[PDB]
Amino acid sequence: KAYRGGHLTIRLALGGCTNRPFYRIVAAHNKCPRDGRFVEQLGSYDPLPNSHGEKLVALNLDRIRHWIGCGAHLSKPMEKLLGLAGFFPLHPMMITNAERLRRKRAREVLLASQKT
Amino acid sequence: ATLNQMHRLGPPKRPPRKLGPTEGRPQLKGVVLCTFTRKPKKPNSANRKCCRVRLSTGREAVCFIPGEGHTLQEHQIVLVEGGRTQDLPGVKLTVVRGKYDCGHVQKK
Amino acid sequence: RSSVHARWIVGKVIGTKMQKTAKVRVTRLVLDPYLLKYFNKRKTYFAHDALQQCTVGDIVLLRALPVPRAKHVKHELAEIVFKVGKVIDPVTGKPCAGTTYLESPLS
Amino acid sequence: PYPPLLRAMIIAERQKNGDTSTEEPMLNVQRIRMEPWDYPAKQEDKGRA
Amino acid sequence: PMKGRFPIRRTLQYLSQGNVVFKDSVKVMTVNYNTHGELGEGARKFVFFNIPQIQYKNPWVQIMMFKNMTPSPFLRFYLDSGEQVLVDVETKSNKEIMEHIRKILGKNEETLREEEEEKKQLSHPANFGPRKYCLRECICEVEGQVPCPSLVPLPKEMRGKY
Amino acid sequence: CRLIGIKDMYAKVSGSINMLSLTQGLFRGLSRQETHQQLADKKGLHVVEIREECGPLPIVVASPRGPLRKDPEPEDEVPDVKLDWEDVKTAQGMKRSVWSNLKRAAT
Amino acid sequence: DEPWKYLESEEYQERYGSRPVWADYRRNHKGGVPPQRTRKTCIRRNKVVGNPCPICRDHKLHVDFRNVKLLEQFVCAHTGIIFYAPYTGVCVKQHKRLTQAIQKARDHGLLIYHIPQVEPRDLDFSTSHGAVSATPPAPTLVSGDPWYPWYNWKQPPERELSRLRRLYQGHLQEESGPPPESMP
Amino acid sequence: RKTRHDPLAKSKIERVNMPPAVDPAEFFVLMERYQHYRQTVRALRMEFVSEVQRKVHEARAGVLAERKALKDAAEHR
Amino acid sequence: VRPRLIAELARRVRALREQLNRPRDSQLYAVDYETLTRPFSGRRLPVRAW
Amino acid sequence: KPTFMDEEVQSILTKMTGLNLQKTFKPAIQELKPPTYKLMTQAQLEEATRQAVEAAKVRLKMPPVLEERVPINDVLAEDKILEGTETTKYVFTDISYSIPHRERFIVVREPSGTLRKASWEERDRMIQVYFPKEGRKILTPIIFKEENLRTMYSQDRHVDVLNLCFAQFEPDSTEYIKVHHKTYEDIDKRGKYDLLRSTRYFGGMVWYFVNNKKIDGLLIDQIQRDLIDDATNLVQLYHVLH
RNA sequence: AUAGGUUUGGUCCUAGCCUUUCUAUUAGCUCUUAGUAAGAUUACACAUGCAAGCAUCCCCGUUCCAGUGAGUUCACCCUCUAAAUC
Ligand SMILES: [Mg+2]
Ligand SMILES: [Mg+2]
Ligand SMILES: [Zn+2]
């Protein structure tokens, strides 16, 4: 299909039931839908903890060196996972959300010390 | 047919034949016009209370009323179903009992 | 490189009844998916020439063009493989009929 | 420095070539510019409605 | 039964038993064979049996057959560059010429063995294909993960009745 | 086959299904059987197995009562046998009925 | 009360002997070909309806994983595959009990079965690679410095702070300084 | 979604869209994160497009591609 | 193949009722300065520009 | 100099591993295809026996005894920034095909903001949640426990355990080693030694023993049947190893 | 198809019809509770309400998603190459 504004973007895809999400990294064009087609299938993302504490994830990395090597953008939740993979720098937006609970903990230890 | 013959023909090639109830639909509604009686084919002898219905289409097809009694007269909406009635020689539709104006049978 | 598809073809001329082109009948072998025997499915390709070398009945090579040069002209007759009758028998290159040597070897 | 994995990866492969070469894996930065977000555009890239 | 004379030629296992697959630069193989020669029986049993096996493996090369156009049987090939190989076949069997092309214009087995891994890598094992392209549509369809809430009732850590 | 002693068997009767010509044609075929001891005796040659549970071992079945012929057999491959269409199209396995791959009782 | 004392005792050899359990039962159905989904329930909760299943007519045949020879009766001897339900004619609820307890007893090892001799995962057994050998660690990280010194709060001079007060005068928020580093 | 025309009804003719607030102790490091993140990523892009370019160069006119390309035109002749 | 004459033509007069009478810089960019509404656009302005 | 994969020390333990071809290629219990019929003369029988011994040798060449583990846990990145901010343990896997298996980068993240390096128990499991093959349930099956094993050595099942480890645990691990030696211990107590004679008998039984000086339990076997040079060409092998 | 019933006074053969199996919708009678899938028939008419906004204004985007099956050989491969992202 010929779209408008098209570029390849590395995105997540929902392949689950209700109350069991599963995310699936693919390379897809900008405009084709979430549960639509793609150009190449990448790693997977398990968003729920199984037995003995595990929220799994994959990264088919030597072709994301190719598919970002042809100049494809990414999505803001996708860079949350490559950056926390140590493949890419830790996301500064994730660093804010890392820090804005320390601020919540800078009023949590207050409300527990102003009390007791 | 030799080998050059069967390549010229190709595979087998068939249509269906959609039956009595128009273009192979399960049930069909209609309105009754006449409830008369028809006499069966040669091994059998009875007289079977079968109606005439114009369907949803507007086609009058003669139809069979199963069960002991019929109450239908001339304006009632009945829902016909397509089973051939084997001692009638061309009655192909039947009414389902307990529907849309015709109720169930009077059980003793 | 080129734009037309079938790059390299040998065929047979049917009719040269236009000017500086010939009508060439070529046969592939395609398989029946069921009957599983190979059958000559033909197709008709045009062939452009310069010298009007071909006559109606010869077996011709024809090479594809980088661009079609008409609506239907597609290849040029790059070589004429088997002449009508005057077939040079390609190993032992000398004139012959069907199966019999006109100019016999040991010449 | 490279991010923790490609920094870990490339030094391992040189160790598979046969030259040890224990220099730190540094990628250039000066070859990429630093225009912040109020650098202006050029007008024929845009188009008036 | 089957309707031929030698009816094993039409079985789709036979057509794969041929092994002579042509390089990318052969674009026409044209065969010419006598019909009643006592000396050319290999080029009669060539086109009788073997060239259906060739066409199933290089299915885009044009093959064409002529009957009484020449006293001696031959093959002639039409390469992409423009030269014409002239294989001769006279007083050979149909067996030697299934060996005389695979050593000339048949692909090297090194060049087909390296052609067999790349047909595998695009059917890569850890993709999650819809049971037609690859396995495991869910991660529930490997063990250890929380399994697909049609298969189990899932714990109360879900929404909706949380 | 329960009365003969046969425990595993595939058989399909095509054509007419008549209960007497079936059995008099059952006992006709099953009487004319090539035993493997008699498979040797006509040809003199040695009879083996190649099973799917064992390896490629040529495990022996029957040997002649006496001598053995020396020459290797004339192995003219892909033989002139009238092989049946309802079994080789099965071995390709495209066409399917809802009446073949079934789960019935224990015979 | 805890079987495997039944399959060798005297009510067994006076009922079945050398034949399998299912050698008298074969089912009642319509014409010809029997249905693929066998009846699921042999007994429903208080009583049994009609003909009972082979493992439902006896109340003294109960299946488990240590009933070694009874479970051998429902696997073909030279073909290791469990029979489908309409071969035996058992209820398929009892055949879910038989498709676990075979494998539950296959997984305990008290039933002999086949495993093919396999080929290894890799042709190389070399273990000197930078993920599996040792890794020369970071000249930042040996020193107590993380990566990339821009993570920790380089608090700006006040000139950049007051830049927004004349940009965003009607809307600001009030704060504290650099973070407290670790947690309880 | 909308299809150029449909009347953009009463809910959003005016809904005054005030923004969230600004974090100047962190925003003047958050602005200093992004120029330290957009520039480092833009260094990895030219690591990889040049990488992909050599992966095209090694199979077009590559040193073991040229040796293959002269091999076959010998083993042909 | 269908030649699409009225589709081509109504393009070339759509450009002609765009090229010849393109609306100039003023009558879209006038602002009613009290409600921050403009003629010919309907859209008022973001929060950092009041 | 110890060096099990030397060229001559195989050829003796390959030789004292028996040929005994009917025990080797028993018919496996599987779903059989109906047997195929070849008819081969005494000239072409002998080329088909020798093929079945040419194909028998290649089933007698794997494994080696393979260098008991070291547990690799070094940390590459340990950021003091995350540390208990967002939990549950991400595990990162490089996937392609054209990298070999021990050359693979599998990385875990921790709720405390470290980057741990996926200890040896996890990495081969993380291969098998992703790169599946024959048998191989990715967790520990309930056969390999000491009680569930002690049912199994009763049933003349030692090849059946030695062929279970060859899927489940790679022979450089410890859970291959701690349940192979759990088997060859119990092979010696009540010595039942003629059971392992032509599947991985080049080193699984003897190269355990020649390190562990319990070879008196293996030479009684070499005088019970006949096995004459079989005895003497390993009592020499005590001195040239130790 | 592992096939079975039916031409006749009967047999054999050719033969169609039907039965047995599976799936999908409607209809009857009937129905305890959770979970996941799935859910106008009609390209027939539509009351209503919601479905494109973001943003230091410009632009961009509402040409995408989502829908339906009216029509129909504009879907796949090669050549040449234009918009789009690097
Ligand atoms: Mg409407
Ligand atoms: Mg239509
Ligand atoms: Zn699911």
XYZ file of N, CA and C in Angstrom, chain I residues 12-42:
93
model
N -7.865 19.086 -12.197
C -7.205 20.209 -12.838
C -8.014 21.490 -12.737
N -9.263 21.410 -12.288
C -9.941 22.642 -11.922
C -9.984 22.781 -10.412
N -9.577 21.751 -9.679
C -9.382 21.920 -8.247
C -8.099 22.683 -7.979
N -7.068 22.426 -8.781
C -5.860 23.232 -8.703
C -6.118 24.638 -9.216
N -6.993 24.779 -10.214
C -7.361 26.066 -10.792
C -8.208 26.913 -9.856
N -9.141 26.310 -9.116
C -9.722 27.009 -7.982
C -8.862 26.969 -6.732
N -7.653 26.406 -6.801
C -6.648 26.682 -5.788
C -5.603 27.678 -6.276
N -5.073 27.532 -7.492
C -3.977 28.391 -7.950
C -4.430 29.821 -8.213
N -5.581 29.972 -8.859
C -5.994 31.282 -9.331
C -6.501 32.126 -8.174
N -7.249 31.505 -7.268
C -7.846 32.179 -6.120
C -7.390 31.585 -4.792
N -6.095 31.375 -4.636
C -5.538 31.078 -3.326
C -5.736 32.242 -2.358
N -6.273 31.987 -1.164
C -6.584 33.079 -0.236
C -5.324 33.666 0.377
N -5.240 34.997 0.362
C -3.995 35.692 0.655
C -3.679 35.695 2.149
N -2.608 36.415 2.489
C -2.012 36.294 3.813
C -2.847 36.965 4.890
N -3.782 37.824 4.505
C -4.461 38.669 5.469
C -5.734 38.057 6.030
N -6.652 37.584 5.191
C -7.996 37.279 5.660
C -8.104 35.959 6.395
N -7.024 35.192 6.463
C -6.952 34.079 7.392
C -6.208 34.456 8.659
N -5.358 35.474 8.589
C -4.477 35.807 9.697
C -4.921 37.044 10.462
N -6.057 37.624 10.110
C -6.685 38.586 10.996
C -7.140 37.863 12.249
N -7.047 38.530 13.387
C -7.511 37.956 14.641
C -8.546 38.893 15.232
N -9.691 38.342 15.610
C -10.523 39.034 16.575
C -9.850 38.949 17.938
N -9.315 40.081 18.381
C -8.285 40.148 19.407
C -8.828 39.989 20.812
N -10.129 39.782 20.961
C -10.759 39.721 22.266
C -11.044 38.284 22.679
N -11.470 37.449 21.733
C -11.708 36.031 21.951
C -10.624 35.147 21.353
N -9.591 35.747 20.746
C -8.457 35.057 20.108
C -8.906 34.120 18.987
N -10.060 34.418 18.403
C -10.572 33.728 17.233
C -10.108 34.463 15.986
N -9.897 33.715 14.913
C -9.566 34.315 13.633
C -10.749 34.126 12.698
N -10.913 34.953 11.675
C -11.695 34.518 10.518
C -11.030 33.346 9.817
N -11.876 32.530 9.190
C -11.545 31.555 8.153
C -10.806 30.329 8.694
N -10.624 30.238 10.020
C -9.907 29.121 10.641
C -10.635 28.492 11.815
N -11.360 29.281 12.608
C -12.147 28.765 13.708
C -11.375 28.367 14.947
